[PDB]
Amino acid sequence: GSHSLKYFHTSVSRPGRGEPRFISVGYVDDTQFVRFDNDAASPRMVPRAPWMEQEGSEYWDRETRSARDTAQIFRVNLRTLRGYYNQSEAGSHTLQWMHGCELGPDGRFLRGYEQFAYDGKDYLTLNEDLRSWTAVDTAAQISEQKSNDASEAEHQRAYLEDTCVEWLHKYLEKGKETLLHLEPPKTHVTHHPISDHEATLRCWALGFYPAEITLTWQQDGEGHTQDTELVETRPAGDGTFQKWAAVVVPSGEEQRYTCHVQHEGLPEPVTLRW
Amino acid sequence: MIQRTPKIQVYSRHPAENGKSNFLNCYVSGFHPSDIEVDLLKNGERIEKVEHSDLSFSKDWSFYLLYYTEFTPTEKDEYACRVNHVTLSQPKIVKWDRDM
Amino acid sequence: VIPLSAPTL
């Protein structure tokens, strides 16, 4: 189906306690495959998926150069932003940068995006045309002007429309055995009495990849969204995900409630009951 | 000035079977800023060797991390996660419940 | 791979 190559970069100042902490992570779809952390034992770009361990020293060198350069520019950006907002040299501040390219199911470029945040909210955003920027306030307006002066959108558009697409294809080949594998959920229901006349039904989905899933409870074959407790999809730690949904029902009526599971890995949507 | 409190889930990698090796997870998400400490506890005492994922974030800019360690559940041992963040009044302890 | 240009703000 659709695929995406995305990165998340975070730089956090720590006045008096060193250069800002800088962490970069790359994902293909829901799979992390690289990281750069300037506090790590090896503060370079390194593999974080098994299928990247073969890549060769030229790749790590180019990515380390790029990441180091990004950390340096972000360090400067944090100083500049302090100046724009008239903030003290004493506080910790955060600069975040996210970018990605997305291919549709037909294999072709669908969309690219790129955004910056300062202290946890939008700062500067690349427009959908990939040719211009939106600034949140008069500070980011200065950043927009500098980007215009330096034709920064041209550099970002070449990356998103070309380089990003090219490497996404390469990474999908290198990691195909796991990136293209759909792993369906293993599902079951648990049942626990909660009062003299009620019980919890909990519908579990375990061990699935990718993360996208729909878990719902129905009562007599109709929607029951308002009365369902849902947890956020959470990582198992082995590259698969988990989720559950629970409802509280009258004792003796369990059989009228059905759990419905939709996931790309299932031949057909599944239903389970107690 | 935007701060967001961490959401915390404590859980096992696989359905817990007493006496069988497993992984204990503490997933923290939806928080800002990124500075956080997460400790896994066995019978109230901090487990020394714990690993964690690389800091990443969601479309809304909030951070998420997984902390994890090998463990072998038993009937008698209690496990928990302790989270230290600026948004919390004091470190928050969330107990592991094998049914959640 | 990551972009060869990181924006200056």
Author numbering:
A (entry chain A): 1 to 274
B (entry chain B): 1 to 100
C (entry chain P): 1 to 9
Authors' account:
The primary function of HLA-E has been ascribed to presenting self-peptides to NK cells. Complexes of HLA-E and self-peptide serve as ligands for the inhibitory receptor NKG2A, ensuring that healthy cells presenting appropriate peptide ligands are protected from NK cell attack. The Nsp13232-240 epitope is presented by HLA-E and position 2 serves as a main anchor for HLA-E-restricted peptides.
In addition to two described mutations in the Spike protein, one of the mutations corresponding to the dominance and spread of BQ.1 is a single nucleotide substitution, which results in a methionine to isoleucine substitution at position 2 (pM2I) in the HLA-E-restricted Nsp13232-240 epitope. Here, we report that a recently emerged methionine to isoleucine substitution at position 2 (pM2I) of Nsp13232-240 impairs binding of the mutated epitope to HLA-E and diminishes HLA-E/peptide complex stability. Comparison of these high-resolution structures demonstrated that the conformations of the two epitopes were largely conserved. Detailed examination of the HLA-E B-pocket, responsible for binding the p2 residue of the peptide, revealed that the CG2 atom branching from the side chain of the mutated isoleucine p2I in BQ. This interaction induces Y7 to tilt towards the N-terminal part of the peptide-binding cleft, rendering the van der Waals distances between p2I and Y7 as well as between Y7 and G26 unfavorable. Conversely, the viral peptides VMPLSAPTL (BA.5) and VIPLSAPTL (BQ.1) share a serine at position 5 (p5S) and a threonine at position 8 (p8T), precluding direct interactions with NKG2A/CD94. Instead, the diminished presentation of the mutated epitope decreases NK cell activity indirectly, by allowing for heightened concomitant presentation of inhibitory self-peptides.
